[PDB]
Amino acid sequence: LSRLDKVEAEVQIDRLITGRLQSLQTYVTQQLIRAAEIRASANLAATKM
């Protein structure tokens, strides 16, 4: 923001928006894959208990 005029400063930060969100989308996707895995273990633990 502090080096580029607003006419095209949105373009570069847009790449961060597409970028930083993309990592967030991957992290949550990793989480659900791990979230389901734990519940399978948890349900196994539930039966064990």
Binding site: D5, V7, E8
Partner: protein
């Protein structure tokens, strides 16, 4: 919905700042076109008149 027909006269070497979002003396102090501007910008030499 509606039409805005803006009329003004400037130097011929001044049209660059008319582009949306651009900056300088024009877009800083006298004429700021919106970022989401919708339309066409028309100019022609008028030294004779």
């Amino acid at each position: 919905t509606n039409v805005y027909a803006d009329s003004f006269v400037i130097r011929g070497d001044e049209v660059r700042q008319i582009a949306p979002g651009q900056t300088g003396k024009i877009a800083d102090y006298n004429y700021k076109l919106p970022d989401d501007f919708t339309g066409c910008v028309i100019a022609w030499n008028s030294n004779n008149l």
